[PDB]
Amino acid sequence: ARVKGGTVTRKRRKKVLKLAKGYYGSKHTLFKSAKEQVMNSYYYAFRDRRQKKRDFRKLWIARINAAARMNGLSYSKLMHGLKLAEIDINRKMLADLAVNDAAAFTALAEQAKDAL
Amino acid sequence: PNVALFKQDGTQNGEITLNEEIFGIEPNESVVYDAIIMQRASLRQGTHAVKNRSAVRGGGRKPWRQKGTGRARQGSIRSPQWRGGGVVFGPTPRSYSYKFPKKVRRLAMKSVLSDKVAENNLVAVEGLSFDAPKTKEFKQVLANLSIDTKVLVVLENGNDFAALSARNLPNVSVVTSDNVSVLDVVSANKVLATQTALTQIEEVL
Amino acid sequence: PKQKTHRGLAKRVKRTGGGGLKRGRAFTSHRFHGKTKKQRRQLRKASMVAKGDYKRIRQQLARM
Amino acid sequence: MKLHELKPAEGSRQVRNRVGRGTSSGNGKTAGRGQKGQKARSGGGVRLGFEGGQTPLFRRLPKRGFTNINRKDYAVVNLDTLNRFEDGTEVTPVVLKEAGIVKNEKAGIKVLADGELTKKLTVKAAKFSKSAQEAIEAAGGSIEVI
RNA sequence: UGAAAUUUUAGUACCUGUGAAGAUGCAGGUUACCCGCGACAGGACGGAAAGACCCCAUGGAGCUUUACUGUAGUUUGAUAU
RNA sequence: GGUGUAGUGGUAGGAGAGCGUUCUAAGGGCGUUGAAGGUCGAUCGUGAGGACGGCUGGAGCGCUUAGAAGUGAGAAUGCCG
RNA sequence: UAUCCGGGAGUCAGACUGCGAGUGAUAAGAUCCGUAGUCGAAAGGGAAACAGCCCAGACCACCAGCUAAGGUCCCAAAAUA
RNA sequence: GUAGCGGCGAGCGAAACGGGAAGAGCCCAAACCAACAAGCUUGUUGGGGUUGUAGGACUCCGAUAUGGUAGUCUGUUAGUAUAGUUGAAGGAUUUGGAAAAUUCCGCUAAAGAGGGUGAAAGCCCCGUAGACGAAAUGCUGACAACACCUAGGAGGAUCCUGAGUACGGCGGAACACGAGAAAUUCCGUCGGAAUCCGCGGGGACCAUCCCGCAAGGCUAAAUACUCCCUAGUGACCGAUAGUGAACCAGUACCGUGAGGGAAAGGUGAAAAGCACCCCGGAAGGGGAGUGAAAUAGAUCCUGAAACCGUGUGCCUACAACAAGUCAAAGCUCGUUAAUGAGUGAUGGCGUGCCUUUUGUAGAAUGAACCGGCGAGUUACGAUUGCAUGCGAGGUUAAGUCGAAGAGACGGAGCCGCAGCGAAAGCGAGUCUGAAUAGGGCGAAUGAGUAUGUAGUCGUAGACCCGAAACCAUGUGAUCUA
Numbered sequence A: 001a002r003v004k005g006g007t008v009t010r011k012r013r014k015k016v017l018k019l020a021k022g023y024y025g026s027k028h029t030l031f032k033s034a035k036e037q038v039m040n041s042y043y044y045a046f047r048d049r050r051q052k053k054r055d056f057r058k059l060w061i062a063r064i065n066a067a068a069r070m071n072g073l074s075y076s077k078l079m080h081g082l083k084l085a086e087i088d089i090n091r092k093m094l095a096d097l098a099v100n101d102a103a104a105f106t107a108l109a110e111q112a113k114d115a116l
Numbered sequence B: 001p002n003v004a005l006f007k008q009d010g011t012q013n014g015e016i017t018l019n020e021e022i023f024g025i026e027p028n029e030s031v032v033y034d035a036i037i038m039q040r041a042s043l044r045q046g047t048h049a050v051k052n053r054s055a056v057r058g059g060g061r062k063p064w065r066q067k068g069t070g071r072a073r074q075g076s077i078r079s080p081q082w083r084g085g086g087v088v089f090g091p092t093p094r095s096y097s098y099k100f101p102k103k104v105r106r107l108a109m110k111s112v113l114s115d116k117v118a119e120n121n122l123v124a125v126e127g128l129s130f131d132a133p134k135t136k137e138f139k140q141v142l143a144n145l146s147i148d149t150k151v152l153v154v155l156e157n158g159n160d161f162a163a164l165s166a167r168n169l170p171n172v173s174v175v176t177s178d179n180v181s182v183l184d185v186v187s188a189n190k191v192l193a194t195q196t197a198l199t200q201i202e203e204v205l
Numbered sequence C: 001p002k003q004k005t006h007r008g009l010a011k012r013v014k015r016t017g018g019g020g021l022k023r024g025r026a027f028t029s030h031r032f033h034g035k036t037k038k039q040r041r042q043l044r045k046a047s048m049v050a051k052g053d054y055k056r057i058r059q060q061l062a063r064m
Numbered sequence D: 001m002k003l004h005e006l007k008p009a010e011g012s013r014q015v016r017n018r019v020g021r022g023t024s025s026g027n028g029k030t031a032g033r034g035q036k037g038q039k040a041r042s043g044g045g046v047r048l049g050f051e052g053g054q055t056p057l058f059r060r061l062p063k064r065g066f067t068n069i070n071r072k073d074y075a076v077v078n079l080d081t082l083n084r085f086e087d088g089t090e091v092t093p094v095v096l097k098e099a100g101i102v103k104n105e106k107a108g109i110k111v112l113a114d115g116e117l118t119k120k121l122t123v124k125a126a127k128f129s130k131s132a133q134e135a136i137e138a139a140g141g142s143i144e145v146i
Numbered sequence E: 001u002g003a004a005a006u007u008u009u010a011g012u013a014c015c016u017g018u019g020a021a022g023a024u025g026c027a028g029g030u031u032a033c034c035c036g037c038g039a040c041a042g043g044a045c046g047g048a049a050a051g052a053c054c055c056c057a058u059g060g061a062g063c064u065u066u067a068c069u070g071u072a073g074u075u076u077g078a079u080a081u
Numbered sequence F: 001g002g003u004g005u006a007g008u009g010g011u012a013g014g015a016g017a018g019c020g021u022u023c024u025a026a027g028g029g030c031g032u033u034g035a036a037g038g039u040c041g042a043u044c045g046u047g048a049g050g051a052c053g054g055c056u057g058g059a060g061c062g063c064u065u066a067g068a069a070g071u072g073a074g075a076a077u078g079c080c081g
Numbered sequence G: 001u002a003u004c005c006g007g008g009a010g011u012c013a014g015a016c017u018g019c020g021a022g023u024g025a026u027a028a029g030a031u032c033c034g035u036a037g038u039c040g041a042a043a044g045g046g047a048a049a050c051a052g053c054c055c056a057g058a059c060c061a062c063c064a065g066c067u068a069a070g071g072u073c074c075c076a077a078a079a080u081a
Numbered sequence H: 001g002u003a004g005c006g007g008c009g010a011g012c013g014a015a016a017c018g019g020g021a022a023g024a025g026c027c028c029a030a031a032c033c034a035a036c037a038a039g040c041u042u043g044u045u046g047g048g049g050u051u052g053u054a055g056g057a058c059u060c061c062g063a064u065a066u067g068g069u070a071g072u073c074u075g076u077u078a079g080u081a082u083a084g085u086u087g088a089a090g091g092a093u094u095u096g097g098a099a100a101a102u103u104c105c106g107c108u109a110a111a112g113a114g115g116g117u118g119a120a121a122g123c124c125c126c127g128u129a130g131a132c133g134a135a136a137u138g139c140u141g142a143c144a145a146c147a148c149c150u151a152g153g154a155g156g157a158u159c160c161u162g163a164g165u166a167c168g169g170c171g172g173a174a175c176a177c178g179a180g181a182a183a184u185u186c187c188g189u190c191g192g193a194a195u196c197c198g199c200g201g202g203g204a205c206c207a208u209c210c211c212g213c214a215a216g217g218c219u220a221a222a223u224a225c226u227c228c229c230u231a232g233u234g235a236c237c238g239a240u241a242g243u244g245a246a247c248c249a250g251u252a253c254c255g256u257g258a259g260g261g262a263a264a265g266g267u268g269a270a271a272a273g274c275a276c277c278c279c280g281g282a283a284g285g286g287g288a289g290u291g292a293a294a295u296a297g298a299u300c301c302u303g304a305a306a307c308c309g310u311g312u313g314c315c316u317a318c319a320a321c322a323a324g325u326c327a328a329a330g331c332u333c334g335u336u337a338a339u340g341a342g343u344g345a346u347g348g349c350g351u352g353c354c355u356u357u358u359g360u361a362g363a364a365u366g367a368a369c370c371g372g373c374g375a376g377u378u379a380c381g382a383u384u385g386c387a388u389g390c391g392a393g394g395u396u397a398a399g400u401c402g403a404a405g406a407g408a409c410g411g412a413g414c415c416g417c418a419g420c421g422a423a424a425g426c427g428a429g430u431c432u433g434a435a436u437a438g439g440g441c442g443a444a445u446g447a448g449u450a451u452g453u454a455g456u457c458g459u460a461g462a463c464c465c466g467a468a469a470c471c472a473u474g475u476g477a478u479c480u481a
């Protein structure tokens, strides 16, 4: 018996085209240019889902370094004093403190500068 | 295998004993399954065909040169990748049927009947001797025997009036004690049967 | 159509009880002055077909 | 069984391996034929015992023997069967065929002695082996020849 | 009034370098408001064409001959008419 | 079913589990109070994919088990439009 | 993890790096072997970019942490130690 | 797929036995006899007689019989094909344009096959089951008439029993059989037998034995096939499918011609197909109106995508970016209401997909895009695994009966149970060998078989496309020589 496949193909392609919204021109209308960009988008997504963490860590670190220089100390000597003083404070938290509560960050800096 | 014998009027006449050789066994479900698929594949007809690249009206002319054109290489107007085009393989005239061993067949029959007996879905009768083939009489018989589901009706070779009376009903299949089949019985949920028919079954088997 | 049996094999091997194949030997026809007698007596003794060769010819001499 | 509840036994029926229907099937995009080559072609490959022009095994070996058209191939009964039959009776090819022991009386029944006999029997056949004669006559039977 | 070849998508710079070894697209640096019109033709290893040179195929075709094997004709003989 | 240990990059390729399509047999159920198909949705599933709604539409189609295959397309200088 | 039996394959174009030799002009991203690795079939981090070099083997999620080679004046995280 | 054939290669490949389906056997020349004729034979007619446990003519004995027919527009008779007739049972509520749907109580069935009917109908219709029917022409089968065949027992004194024939040589073919040891059959050529104490065959050939009697002819049935007709069926197609053709298709069109060869289906239940009015030259629109519906109005059901537009929320004219991803301000909306949707300034990272490659972002190949179509299938066999049945017994094939079925019957045959050897032959042993030797192959160790299913192989186009080319018909000198 014969099989045509009218709906399978169309549904399978509408899925990709819905995934391909926001893409310039042909890349949201045509299945080939879209699919070729959906796969690359997923590659980039998988990769950025790792680089995200690197980026925020980098950012936090720059902030901590700035807030320490404003107290007369550097990121590295700060964090070494913390590891000495057994102070397990995440860098995310420490950046939030450097932004909002400069006094808490200053207290941590005093702890570290005593540890050293 | 003690089975309640009823009348054509519904009253219970008594009992009949049946061969444990046939009705008492454990059923073999794989065997029943095999027999089912075989009988359906046999009732299949297999008349279906298609025209390949050869049987299709046309071809011969290579529609253009091998070379020179900026056109793909093509060798016939009726190859598979043309708007007409012979089908690549497709169906053929084909026989799906197959025989398979007699012991498996007879074990299938025994297994089916024994399953019916275990589920109590036999109904024996002494009569079914209709003066004439009216179907409402047979329907009243079914009602007296409290049947409301599908049913297969086994009959001795000659009870024509009863066969005709049972024929037209949708719930009812009818068969004559030698043409009995696994597909018929298994399709049916219950089995009305004459004592004569049961004896014919137990002598042919 | 059923298989065709390779008659050149059917003339040159023989089934044993384990299904293996017996065979005559080579270097046993016409040029014996170049062969020592140990070779001649050891080559008039039949041998058996190899594993990888039976793998290649069984489909030909399936029943035979 | 019920037709709306059918099942086979496990492992009895297997799902076909369809070929060239995507990469994640594994049998896709080449059909398990691999990259280019004579084996990767429709109707490709080679003959069934072909070594690539190298001298084939059949050709490098000698023909041996002949066939005797007058050969007598006998149907064998190995003396462990006949413990069936009641002692004192008469064994024949007709008896053996009716029982179903010997279906092909090729050239005649030959009797051979591998198993132990334990009966008196008036056996008869085309040929006996000497060990079978000894065993039968020792049990107390009697050899004849048709 | 109204085509065609072509066309993976394109918001389609330059130098140096890299790299399937000669980059609009990668890197580093530099330059450059957005959109067009007329002209030119350096590049897009531009288009047209499954390189015609070359090599391969246990491919093909035509042709030659003291390659092989045959043959139509020519000739000689025997036999029949 | 759970606890622990160890592992789970992958081409050719081998093995096993599946999703989906058309049809059939049986069972059961849904449709002018609006089926399939079309379209939009911010939904569920590990994946193939599956539902539920809104609009369109106007008559056939699902669900469970099993079976049979013209059973899944993005490329063929592919064919037709 | 080795062996034996049997089913099914694919592979017979390999490349570079380091060490050992030949041919070479002890030239070649050359050629041919051995040996080990990597690629091929391997993403990721460094070498600017850079299959083949150094570190290291992606089952998934985390806006958590410790390290590797390589690095810490800015681009660009870390010492103007 | 045996025995054999075969560059003993590739491959080719029987027959008989056995089982079944169907069944039927008959004529003539010749010897001789009777008649006619020319010129005792020898042409014609009739009679006679057709064979191998040899037969017939011929010489003697009685039947006048007895059965059959593969014949006849001899007729009748019966049936059947080609028209046809009849053929049961339901009305109301809800939805709705319409009821066949829903609910209610019923009815019917030798009829619940199917189709149509404003939607899905056992009870509305056509019909179905069933029961009747042919003036006329055919056909089939019986029954009578006609017609044609149909005899028995001894002898073999003698005669006949298929002549340029069988056979042989040379050359070639067909036989499974390729000259090979090549029987058998047939064609050409040349030569060239006997005939009942005879002749041919039994795979060179001779002898023996057995079987048969050519050189003359006919013969139904089972078997193959379907342009067609009737009745039908489909785990066949459903408008790029299925016939090339569902549509006025071998058409339009191309070609001198042979020849090739398309595309193109669907309003609505019913045309009820838009009276009339307005714009306009008309077409085409806009109202009105039919209709359940007109975004169902001839491009007519549904009406995707590419593509072309209109408007609108956000962004965009110091920016380079395989065009995305991740983070993110601002703005605007509000969901299958849940760590919401859309947009996106700006920043970080990032050289498409396929193929083929040692290696391709590749300046190596393919793709303009969208949609459809489009590639490991089947038959017969072999083998392995899994499953089932049975088990050292497992199983039927063809064919018959029977729904185009299952099933029963059918044991012929197939595999396995005993192998070893070239073979004779022996036999749990056998072969080699002088050999109780040793060794090889085998057994004591043991399990196979039927079916299904999947992987794989073979033969068939065998996975899909793609050559130049080869061969065999035919068509072309309206161009040009």
Ligand SMILES: [K+]
Pocket: D031, D032, D033, G009
């Ligand atoms: K394979």
Ligand SMILES: [K+]
Pocket: E041, E042
């Ligand atoms: K230019």
Ligand SMILES: [K+]
Pocket: none
């Ligand atoms: K040539």
Ligand SMILES: [K+]
Pocket: A005, A009, F073
């Ligand atoms: K498709």
Ligand SMILES: [K+]
Pocket: none
């Ligand atoms: K590796």
Ligand SMILES: [K+]
Pocket: H121
């Ligand atoms: K109806």
Ligand SMILES: [K+]
Pocket: H182
């Ligand atoms: K011959």
Ligand SMILES: [K+]
Pocket: none
């Ligand atoms: K960006």
Ligand SMILES: [K+]
Pocket: none
């Ligand atoms: K099998």
Ligand SMILES: [K+]
Pocket: none
């Ligand atoms: K088994």
Ligand SMILES: [Mg+2]
Pocket: A040, A043
């Ligand atoms: Mg990528």
Ligand SMILES: [Mg+2]
Pocket: B054, B058, B059, B060
């Ligand atoms: Mg053709």
Ligand SMILES: [Mg+2]
Pocket: B084, B085
């Ligand atoms: Mg077609």
Ligand SMILES: [Mg+2]
Pocket: C028, C029
């Ligand atoms: Mg020799």
Ligand SMILES: [Mg+2]
Pocket: D016
């Ligand atoms: Mg299958």
Ligand SMILES: [Mg+2]
Pocket: D026, D027, F013
């Ligand atoms: Mg693979």
